[PDB]
Design an enzyme around this catalytic site. Structure first.
Site, PDB file in Angstrom:
ATOM      1  CG  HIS A  42      -2.212   0.602   1.057  1.00  0.00           C
ATOM      2  ND1 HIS A  42      -3.169   0.045   0.231  1.00  0.00           N
ATOM      3  CD2 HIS A  42      -2.780   1.673   1.645  1.00  0.00           C
ATOM      4  CE1 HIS A  42      -4.272   0.762   0.309  1.00  0.00           C
ATOM      5  NE2 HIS A  42      -4.063   1.760   1.188  1.00  0.00           N
TER       6      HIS A  42
ATOM      7  CB  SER B  75      -1.627  -1.911  -7.970  1.00  0.00           C
ATOM      8  OG  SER B  75      -2.406  -2.575  -6.993  1.00  0.00           O
TER       9      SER B  75
ATOM     10  CE  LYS C 179     -10.219  -5.664 -16.048  1.00  0.00           C
ATOM     11  NZ  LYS C 179      -9.217  -4.747 -16.639  1.00  0.00           N
ATOM     12  CG  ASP C 180     -11.455  -7.944  -8.528  1.00  0.00           C
ATOM     13  OD1 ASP C 180     -10.611  -8.188  -9.437  1.00  0.00           O
ATOM     14  OD2 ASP C 180     -11.196  -7.256  -7.502  1.00  0.00           O
TER      15      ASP C 180
ATOM     16  CD  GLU D 164      -2.886 -33.589  -4.385  1.00  0.00           C
ATOM     17  OE1 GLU D 164      -3.234 -34.401  -5.275  1.00  0.00           O
ATOM     18  OE2 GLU D 164      -3.668 -32.767  -3.838  1.00  0.00           O
TER      19      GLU D 164
HETATM   20  C1  HEM Z   1      -2.873 -16.237  -0.322  1.00  0.00           C
HETATM   21  C2  HEM Z   1      -2.142 -15.843  -1.360  1.00  0.00           C
HETATM   22  C3  HEM Z   1      -2.206 -14.453  -1.870  1.00  0.00           C
HETATM   23  C4  HEM Z   1      -3.224 -13.528  -1.886  1.00  0.00           C
HETATM   24  C5  HEM Z   1      -4.652 -13.636  -1.338  1.00  0.00           C
HETATM   25  C6  HEM Z   1      -2.699 -12.384  -2.555  1.00  0.00           C
HETATM   26  C7  HEM Z   1      -3.466 -11.238  -2.788  1.00  0.00           C
HETATM   27  C8  HEM Z   1      -3.017 -10.139  -3.501  1.00  0.00           C
HETATM   28  C9  HEM Z   1      -3.815  -9.021  -3.864  1.00  0.00           C
HETATM   29  C10 HEM Z   1      -5.319  -8.867  -3.600  1.00  0.00           C
HETATM   30  C11 HEM Z   1      -2.980  -8.145  -4.516  1.00  0.00           C
HETATM   31  C12 HEM Z   1      -3.382  -6.800  -5.106  1.00  0.00           C
HETATM   32  C13 HEM Z   1      -4.160  -7.078  -6.420  1.00  0.00           C
HETATM   33  C14 HEM Z   1      -3.379  -7.900  -7.438  1.00  0.00           C
HETATM   34  O1  HEM Z   1      -2.328  -7.471  -7.972  1.00  0.00           O
HETATM   35  O2  HEM Z   1      -3.705  -9.045  -7.833  1.00  0.00           O
HETATM   36  C15 HEM Z   1      -1.673  -8.701  -4.523  1.00  0.00           C
HETATM   37  C16 HEM Z   1      -0.569  -8.083  -5.077  1.00  0.00           C
HETATM   38  C17 HEM Z   1       0.681  -8.673  -5.016  1.00  0.00           C
HETATM   39  N1  HEM Z   1       1.010  -9.890  -4.560  1.00  0.00           N
HETATM   40 FE1  HEM Z   1      -0.188 -11.178  -3.838  1.00  0.00          FE
HETATM   41  N2  HEM Z   1      -1.440 -12.595  -2.921  1.00  0.00           N
HETATM   42  C18 HEM Z   1      -1.069 -13.809  -2.537  1.00  0.00           C
HETATM   43  C19 HEM Z   1       0.127 -14.464  -2.731  1.00  0.00           C
HETATM   44  C20 HEM Z   1       1.235 -13.853  -3.264  1.00  0.00           C
HETATM   45  C21 HEM Z   1       2.436 -14.492  -3.562  1.00  0.00           C
HETATM   46  C22 HEM Z   1       2.733 -15.970  -3.365  1.00  0.00           C
HETATM   47  C23 HEM Z   1       3.280 -13.501  -4.042  1.00  0.00           C
HETATM   48  C24 HEM Z   1       4.696 -13.592  -4.475  1.00  0.00           C
HETATM   49  C25 HEM Z   1       5.553 -14.621  -4.583  1.00  0.00           C
HETATM   50  C26 HEM Z   1       2.583 -12.273  -4.053  1.00  0.00           C
HETATM   51  C27 HEM Z   1       3.153 -11.080  -4.433  1.00  0.00           C
HETATM   52  C28 HEM Z   1       2.338  -9.994  -4.706  1.00  0.00           C
HETATM   53  C29 HEM Z   1       2.908  -8.783  -5.293  1.00  0.00           C
HETATM   54  C30 HEM Z   1       4.373  -8.526  -5.624  1.00  0.00           C
HETATM   55  C31 HEM Z   1       1.867  -7.951  -5.486  1.00  0.00           C
HETATM   56  C32 HEM Z   1       1.907  -6.557  -6.098  1.00  0.00           C
HETATM   57  C33 HEM Z   1       1.632  -6.780  -7.589  1.00  0.00           C
HETATM   58  C34 HEM Z   1       1.426  -5.473  -8.327  1.00  0.00           C
HETATM   59  O3  HEM Z   1       0.406  -4.782  -8.209  1.00  0.00           O
HETATM   60  O4  HEM Z   1       2.253  -5.071  -9.130  1.00  0.00           O
HETATM   61  N3  HEM Z   1       1.347 -12.534  -3.571  1.00  0.00           N
HETATM   62  N4  HEM Z   1      -1.727  -9.920  -3.897  1.00  0.00           N
END
Ligand code: HEM
Ligand SMILES: CCCCCCCCCCCCCCCCCC(=O)OC[C@H](COP(=O)([O-])OCC(O)COP(=O)([O-])OC[C@@H](COC(=O)CCCCCCCCCCCCCCCCC)OC(=O)CCCCCCCCCCCCCCCCC)OC(=O)CCCCCCCCCCCCCCCCC
Ligand SMILES: CCCCCCCCCCCCCCCCCC(=O)OC[C@H](COP(=O)([O-])OCC[N+](C)(C)C)OC(=O)CCCCCCCCCCCCCCCCC
Ligand SMILES: CCCCCCCCCCCCCCCCCC(=O)OC[C@H](COP(=O)([O-])OCC[N+](C)(C)C)OC(=O)CCCCCCCCCCCCCCCCC
Ligand SMILES: CCCCCCCCCCCCCCCCCCCC(=O)O[C@H](COC(=O)CCCCCCCCCCCCCC)COP(=O)(O)OCCN
Ligand code: HEM
Ligand SMILES: CCCCCCCCCCCCO[C@@H]1O[C@H](CO)[C@@H](O[C@H]2O[C@H](CO)[C@@H](O)[C@H](O)[C@H]2O)[C@H](O)[C@H]1O
Ligand SMILES: CCCCCCCCCCCCO[C@@H]1O[C@H](CO)[C@@H](O[C@H]2O[C@H](CO)[C@@H](O)[C@H](O)[C@H]2O)[C@H](O)[C@H]1O
Lengths: 402, 63, 55, 273, 438, 124, 124
Positions: D92, D96, D118-119, D162
């Protein structure tokens, strides 16, 4: 100070017996020559910024390794850039001055981020003293332009990078540069300046746009930060007697926890006010000023009346004792001015750049009571009196009241 | 009462030997002892507690 | 700026447990909040452990 | 860097969560999968065997193991939720990123209603996929052997994880040494943490980088091939192929991305002069 | 190489010390006295400062007005200041007005009237001075700093003294003070600029020969201070600028660590946002402060007395929500004097100081002040060659050893004035005097 | 990588006749396939800006250049969300693809790297 | 309860001779046993301040009254944390316990309540 010439640049040096040398570059680039209001102040603050051979950062880091110091100031007549260092480090400082005059980059970001903010803090610090403001306002009324230009850059009139670059093109030239070395071997300086300043433009002598004209009037600078009043008298024919008269009338005490025996000092009895008579010679015109500061506008008003009376009383009759006291105080003032590095540099700078031979303190003329009274008489009977009030201006005197 | 340069009276609390190494060392002995018992207590707690995950008596009986 | 203030995650912890501005005169009855947090931590640790052995 | 690094931990927590949940069925794949995966810990020098017996609560996978996996399987999703929240809080501060790789500070949209609605589209697309599996083909993604009760005597024909763990299993097999294999498998995930360092580009993301896009394509397809090789038998010629694909996987991070990103920097500069 | 400082004594024990400069036309002659407010007790505290006022109020010969006139006629000026351990009375004049000025100084010191009428008049002037120092924030801060660091000790007292004493100081106790303290063995007649030493010695024989000698003549600069870790908070939300001083117990004039402490002080150095070069200084603290706009200024100091000192920093800041950062980063740079400094910082600071100690002496008044200070604190003028050798002897590893015993994990004296809500309590400040990572 | 590095390496290549003969045509093709010009960007618009150095360089841009950059970013964002390409005058022509930012960031970095060097100076 | 209501009810009691005869002595004993004076407080120092109305009333205090209130709060806080009582001049004497804040809050509330009434006016 043995005056000489090295590759078209006038060099004055005086060897001494000290581990500390002062090297000053005096530029004919003070505010009386300012193309644009405040440009001389900005040019002064642009000294030792980035040059092509050496960044501002690198200069400062190396200056710290020599333990040197940098001092710069702007007058109505000059920009003075002074370095203070150990004697042996002379070549470095000569080369640094050469880099500044030949190869300053003058970048927009330096002006916005570095130079202009420093210039602004410089002015705000000076203006904290209402007496500074009053004396500046008095020059503005008295001369309008030239000597009447502000010394310092102000916010209401912004200086652009093009303004400063143009002014520097005129000022940074063999014709407008004098080098003054205190505790510097004269032969060594000539050799170094001769190699370092050889490729500096010749340029032409900078001149005042327009002849010096004298005007009377009033300035009423409303501030909330203290009270001052200047009573100035523009002089068309500057004469050395006004120095003696300034020191005679006096104003500051020569002794702690005292008033002083000077007429202006005795005008402040019963008040928490201070007073200072000064005379400013500018070659083609002069200004005789009496500045009074204090916290009470009523007390300032009271002193102001006694101050003009003191000047009239002097025009009547001076005693022999008082004339001798004026000679002594004036000889002393001359001596300490030639000792202080800032003022020293500009004194010899004037001699080199213009042609006004310095009056050695030991050659300061003794004025008879006749000559002093005649000088005060001219001033009391001036057709163009200037009065600058600063602070609670509604409660300070007017010219016609004085 | 009025002057702020007259420090209020701290003589009931001030130690004469406030600048000495012995003075500082004493307070660090207390801090250190507390850290020591906390380390010993944490170690004992962690060891006893986590041993629940090692083979229980009924599992060891069948081995 | 100190890292504890600059980094947003560290700053959240900082705001609650370190720089958090407290009255200077809390008495011992203000200590029950942290005892409740302790009970909760004990119950989580012991409870999860019991769950490894309970049917 | 911080949301990405927390993200790498989320990914590890998901793996552990899913591994333990799979054991809970206590079918043949549950038991034998737990046995082989937990025996990898035996490779830790000196204390490895003791640690395995400690994890099992006994001398093999049995009741103590199952009961502790239940407790921890229940817990781990809560830990995962916390880390998911943490990576969003970390995000935050910058907001993004976007597909162009430029700042969006010039042109922002409220999350609601734009991304809320959109989601919903992808929520319903997801639910359609969910429906097709759950109602029409519920066992397509599973192993039939997990419908046989765990039997410590009989070993199943092939013990595979798996599908989602298969690439890491292929990486493990590639290294002949036990400890080597375990290290490589863990390193295959932890190496994600060095992407911020080895990417030398002055530009964020691949939208404008033809060579990076091709390299990315090969990297992704290699990861899928590793997945396939995780479930083949240890037989020629898949043994050597698995080794080549493992080398390629690591060389993306260590060699190719640093080189390609360096060269693209130069091409952008020279190409636009 | 500056001309040699000549030194002679009289029979009473008055030292005459001179440094001639044939390039100048003015001369500063004066009397440096190894005596100041510290010599008062609690009852006559303020006497030394009181006397300084009355010294210019008239003598047995010249009245107040005659005194004024005599100095006016000479052309130069007279000046005086009283500190905790030192009193100075000097006269700047022309070369050939030196005999007049010596005569006037000898008169005001030995033969001052101290007339009840003048005591009563100054008693109001000095009362008004109590309510106007209030504006000089730096002075307010440093006076509270001494008051708390040397709590209930002579060095802790102000120079002006309490209001109560001002109302009760008599000519009797004034006379007693200057008779006990202004003795020939505690006084140095100093000449700098256009002075002949032999001429000055003759003037001393003429005017200062009937000075009392003390019963027990100790050497010049002879003195137990017990530093108190403590704080004074003078919160004033209406002020825009916070002024903060932090100090530890420092070093005396004759400490073996005197130069080590000066080098340490130069590693932190000074900073002022109004000076153009300050953003480019090498000092780490300077960089942190300028990049983050944490302060308007800071000034490191190492103040010495005969038997103690204060070493620390004075900060001014408008950044009222980041006072915590400013103080934090300052004390972390002090920590590095113990943990991290190497030959890199030390050799840089030594280079800067080798020049700085010489640069300072640039006019006759500065030279006279240097001769007078050194003669009254060390008993001798230390030549630049000796000073260069003492600086050269300071190694990185001397600095580390000094900081580890003087700064590291030590009590501080802390004074805050102005909008200092953001200045944390004593413990959190003092906790920054060490690093848990080391 | 620092802009400084990229610029210095590129200059080494442009000096070598052989090297330039090979690299310059490849770089021009790369830039054509990159396709940032089809969204109306200039190359310098793509440089990562979320660094102290780059934020400082952007603050030093002349107001005009700064206003135009903002418009190009907004326009490209609009093409991106619409899944459209620039047409006509919106397409950046090769002659319009000027390195407006490079001089500013090179100056920012020059000072930052000099500062790092001078922080490590050793009196000899 | 609003300060207005408290003040009005109190004035009804003070008017009634019989009522005042019973209530005033009880109120004076109550205040003695309350013991806020033993921490150097004035009664008005205790009034809840975390409301818009009271924040406005506090801003309207003359600067001197405001500075003195701050000191009394800090001093009482110091007594509280030390578990000490005021002694000597720190004890609030009955004659010092002045209603410095009541006039300000009564004016704030008068306007606030008039505003509420006038928001509900009906043109007849
Ligand atoms: C329970 C698993 C996860 C949830 C619920 C989650 C959820 C989210 C959400 C809602 C966002 C903001 C919207 C989006 O870009 O899709 C986000 C962004 C991000 N997530 Fe995740 N995430 C998860 C796992 C991960 C993992 C495993 C990674 C990295 C190895 C990761 C790295 C990031 C990064 C770097 C962003 C910023 C992306 C950007 O806007 O450029 N997240 N995540
Ligand atoms: C459960 C887990 C275990 C952990 C223990 C936590 C308990 C700590 C706590 O909150 O109570 C301690 C607590 C001490 O707290 P404190 O911060 O010193 O004082 C709080 C009040 O100011 C204390 O009020 P005070 O200053 O007016 O002192 C009065 C009090 C306490 O007297 C003291 O001097 C103590 O004296 C009494 O005990 C009341 C009189 C009963 C006589 C029969 O004891 C009490 O206050 C007991 C009174 C309760 C009724
Ligand atoms: C629960 C486990 C507790 C572990 C404590 C083990 C030893 C650490 C300790 O006592 O901390 C002292 C130390 C130091 O305490 P300190 O901060 O009071 O000491 C600093 C000053 N010197 C180094 C000069 C003594 O605290 C820490 O390092 C913090 C860790 C505590 C958790
Ligand atoms: C299989 C190989 C995939 C290679 C993708 C190459 C780019 C492409 O054509 O994609 C279309 C698009 C191109 O989008 P773009 O954002 O680059 O371009 C948009 C259009 N222009 C250029 C005009 C602005 O790429 C994506 O959307 C890529 C998202 C990557 C997701 C990959 C998931 C794999 C999971 C493995 C985890 C380990
Ligand atoms: C339980 C066991 C006790 C805590 C373990 C820590 C050991 C204590 C010794 C260490 C110590 O005193 O050093 C401080 C560490 O304390 C700390 O940093 C922690 C201070 C106290 C920790 C307890 C906090 C609240 C406890 C209540 C539980 C909360 C509810 C949640 C379950 C440094 O700190 P310093 O600033 O004094 O430094 C002073 C200069 N370096
Ligand atoms: C607020 C936190 C909790 C409270 C107040 C609480 C309370 C209790 C109580 C009163 C019992 C009955 C104890 C007995 O008499 O034997 C119990 C049993 C149990 N609790 Fe909890 N509990 C908490 C948290 C948890 C958690 C997080 C778990 C995780 C599973 C858990 C697992 C158990 C289990 C397995 C038992 C049964 C075994 C037994 O009786 O000891 N508890 N709990
Ligand atoms: C990061 C932390 C590092 C890993 C933590 C290690 C977890 C397991 C460590 C050892 C636990 C078992 O280790 C074992 O502990 C029990 C107590 O708990 C000890 O047992 C001892 O005390 C218990 C009761 O306290 C007695 O019943 C027993 O007769 C006696 O031997 C053993 O002497 C020790 O061998
Ligand atoms: C109790 C265990 C410790 C973990 C912390 C608890 C997690 C809860 C934190 C998330 C809730 C958001 O918490 C919110 O954070 C910000 C900054 O962090 C705080 O903000 C506060 O501190 C920062 C600086 O420290 C200031 O900029 C701000 O003026 C002030 O209000 C809020 O007062 C707090 O409500």
């Amino acid at each position: 100070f043995s005056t000489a010439e090295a590759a078209g640049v006038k060099v004055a040096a005086q060897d001494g017996q000290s581990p500390i040398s002062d090297l000053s570059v005096v530029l004919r680039g003070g505010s009386r020559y300012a193309t644009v209001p405040g440009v001389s102040h900005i040019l002064e603050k642009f000294a030792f910024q980035n040059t092509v051979p050496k960044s501002a950062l690198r200069f400062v880091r190396e200056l710290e390794l020599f333990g040197g110091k940098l001092y710069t100031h702007t007058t109505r007549e000059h920009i003075v850039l002074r370095t203070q260092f150990l004697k042996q480090d002379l070549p470095y400082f000569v080369d640094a001055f050469a880099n500044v005059l030949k190869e300053t980059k003058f970048q927009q970001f330096e002006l916005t981020e570095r130079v202009a903010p420093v210039a602004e803090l410089d002015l705000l610090k000076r203006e904290s003293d209402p007496a500074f403001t009053a004396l500046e306002a008095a020059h503005e009324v008295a001369f309008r332009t030239g000597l009447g230009n502000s010394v310092y850059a102000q916010g209401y009139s912004p200086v652009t990078l093009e303004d400063v670059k143009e002014f520097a093109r005129q000022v940074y030239a063999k014709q407008n540069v004098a080098v003054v070395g205190n505790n510097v071997v004269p032969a060594d300086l000539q050799q170094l300046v001769g190699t370092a300043f050889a490729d500096l433009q010749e340029g032409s002598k900078v001149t005042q746009a327009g002849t010096t004209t004298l005007h009377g009037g009033e300035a009423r600078v409303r501030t909330s930060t203290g009270n001052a009043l200047t009573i100035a008298l523009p002089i068309a024919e500057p004469k050395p007697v006004y120095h003696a008269l300034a020191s005679f009338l006096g104003g500051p005490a020569s002794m702690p926890w005292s008033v002083g025996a000077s007429p202006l000092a005795q005008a402040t009895v019963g008040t928490h006010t201070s007073v200072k008579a000064t005379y400013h010679n500018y070659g083609d015109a002069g200004l005789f000023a009496i500045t009074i500061k204090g916290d009470s506008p009523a007390e300032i008003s009271q002193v102001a009346h006694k101050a003009v009376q003191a000047l009239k009383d002097t025009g009547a009759e001076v005693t022999e004792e008082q004339a001798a006291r004026a000679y002594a105080k004036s000889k002393f003032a001359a001596a300490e001015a030639f000792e202080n590095p800032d003022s020293s540099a500009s004194v010899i700078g004037m001699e080199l750049l213009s042609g006004v031979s310095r009056i050695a303190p030991e050659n300061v003329q003794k004025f008879t009571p006749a000559e002093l009274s005649e000088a005060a008489a001219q001033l009391s009977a001036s057709a163009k009196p200037v009065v600058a009030a600063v602070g609670q201006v509604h409660a300070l005197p007017f010219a016609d009241e004085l | 009462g009025k002057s702020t340069y007259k420090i209020p009276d701290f003589t009931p609390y001030l130690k004469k030997d406030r600048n000495t190494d012995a003075n500082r060392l004493f307070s660090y002995f207390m801090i250190g002892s507390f850290g020591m018992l906390s380390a010993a207590g944490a170690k004992a707690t962690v060891q006893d507690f986590l041993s629940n995950m090692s083979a229980s008596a009924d599992v060891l009986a069948m081995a | 700026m100190a890292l504890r203030k600059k980094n947003s995650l560290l700053n959240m912890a900082n705001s609650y447990v370190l720089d958090s501005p407290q009255p200077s005169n809390l008495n011992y009855f203000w200590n029950f909040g942290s005892l409740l947090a302790l009970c909760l931590v004990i119950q989580l640790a012991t409870g999860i452990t019991l769950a490894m052995h309970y049917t | 860097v911080l949301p990405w690094s927390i993200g790498v931990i989320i990914f590890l927590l998901l793996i552990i969560t899913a591994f333990m949940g799979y054991v809970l069925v206590f079918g043949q794949m549950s038991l034998w999968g737990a046995t082989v995966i937990c025996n990898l810990v035996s490779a830790i020098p000196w204390l490895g065997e003791d640690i395995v017996h400690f994890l099992w609560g006994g001398f093999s996978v049995g009741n103590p193991t199952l009961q502790r996996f239940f407790a921890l399987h229940y817990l781990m999703p809560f830990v995962l939720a916390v880390f998911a929240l943490l990576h969003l809080i970390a995000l935050h501060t910058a907001g993004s990123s976007n597909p162009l790789g430029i700042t969006s500070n010039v042109d922002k949209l409220s999350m609601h209603p734009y991304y809320s609605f959109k989601d919903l589209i992808t929520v319903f697309a997801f639910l359609l996929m969910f429906t097709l599996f759950v109602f029409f083909s519920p066992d397509k993604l599973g192993h039939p052997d997990n419908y046989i009760p765990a039997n410590p005597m009989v070993t199943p024909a092939s013990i595979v994880p798996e599908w989602y763990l298969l690439p890491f299993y292929a990486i493990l097999r590639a290294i002949p040494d036990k400890l080597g294999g375990v290290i490589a498998m863990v390193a295959a995930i932890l190496i994600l943490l060095i992407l911020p360092i080895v990417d030398r580009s002055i530009i964020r993301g691949n939208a404008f980088k033809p060579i990076s896009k091709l390299l990315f394509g090969f990297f992704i397809c290699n990861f899928l091939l590793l997945g396939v090789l995780g479930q083949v038998h240890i037989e020629p010629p898949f043994i050597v192929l698995g080794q080549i694909c493992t080398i390629f996987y690591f060389s993306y991070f260590l060699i190719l991305l640093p080189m390609v990103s360096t060269i693209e920097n130069i091409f952008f500069y020279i190409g636009s002069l | 190489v500056s001309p040699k400082t000549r030194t002679s004594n009289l029979k009473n024990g008055l030292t005459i010390a001179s440094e001639s400069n044939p390039l100048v036309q003015t001369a500063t002659v004066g009397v440096w006295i190894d005596a100041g407010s510290r010599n008062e007790n609690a009852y006559n505290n303020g006497t030394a400062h009181f006397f300084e006022h009355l010294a210019f109020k008239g003598t047995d010969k010249r009245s107040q007005h005659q005194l004024e006139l005599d100095i006016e006629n000479m052309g130069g000026h007279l000046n005086a200041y009283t500190s905790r351990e030192s009193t100075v009375y000097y006269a700047k004049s022309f070369k050939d007005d030196v005999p007049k000025s010596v005569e006037i100084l000898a008169d005001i010191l030995q033969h001052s009237k101290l007339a009840e009428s003048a005591i009563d008049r100054e008693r109001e002037v000095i009362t008004r001075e109590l309510e106007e120092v209030n504006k000089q924030y730096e002075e307010v801060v440093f006076d509270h700093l001494h008051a708390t660091a040397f709590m209930n000790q002579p060095l802790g007292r102000t120079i002006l003294g309490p209001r109560e004493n001002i109302q009760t100081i008599t000519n009797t106790e004034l006379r007693k003070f200057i008779t006990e303290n202004y003795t020939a063995d505690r006084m140095v007649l100093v000449g700098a600029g256009a002075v002949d030493h032999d001429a000055l010695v003759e003037l001393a024989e003429k005017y200062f020969s009937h000075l009392p000698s003390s019963q027990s003549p100790v050497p010049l600069g002879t003195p137990i201070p017990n530093f108190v870790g403590s704080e004074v908070r003078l919160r004033d939300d209406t002020m825009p600028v916070a002024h903060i001083a932090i100090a530890v117990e420092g070093v005396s004039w004759t400490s073996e660590d005197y130069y080590t402490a000066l080098v340490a002080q130069a590693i932190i150095g000074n900073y002022d946002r109004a000076v153009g070069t300050s953003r480019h200084q090498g000092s780490r603290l300077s960089n942190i402060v300028s990049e983050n706009n944490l302060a308007n200024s800071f000034q490191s100091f190492s103040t010495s007395y005969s038997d103690t000192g204060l070493w620390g920093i004075y900060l001014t800041s408008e950044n009222t929500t980041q006072i915590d950062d400013l103080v934090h980063f300052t004390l972390k740079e002090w920590n590095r004097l113990s943990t991290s400094v190497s030959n890199l910082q030390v050799e840089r600071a030594k280079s800067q100081l080798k020049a700085g100690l010489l640069l300072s002496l640039d006019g006759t008044t500065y030279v006279a002040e240097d001769i007078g200070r050194q003669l009254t604190t060390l008993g001798r003028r230390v030549t630049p060659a000796e000073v260069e050798a003492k600086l050269e002897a300071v190694t990185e590893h001397d600095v580390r050893a000094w900081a580890q015993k003087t700064l590291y994990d030590k009590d501080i004296a802390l004074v805050g004035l102005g909008p200092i809500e953001g200045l944390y309590d004593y413990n959190r400040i003092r906790n920054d005097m060490s690093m848990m990572r080391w | 990588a620092s802009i400084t590095s990229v610029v210095k390496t590129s200059e080494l290549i442009l000096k070598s006749p052989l090297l330039s003969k090979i690299v310059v045509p490849l770089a021009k093709t790369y830039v054509k396939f990159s396709g940032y010009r089809q969204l109306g960007f200039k190359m310098n618009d793509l440089i990562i800006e979320e660094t102290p150095n780059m934020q400082l360089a952007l603050r030093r841009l002349p107001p005009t250049e700064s206003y135009d950059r903002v418009y190009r970013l907004i326009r490209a964002t609009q093409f991106s969300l619409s899944h459209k390409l620039a047409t006509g005058n919106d397409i950046t022509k090769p002659e319009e693809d000027d390195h407006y930012l490079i001089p500013y960031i090179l100056d920012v970095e020059a000072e930052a790297f000099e500062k790092d060097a001078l922080d490590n100076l050793e009196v000899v």
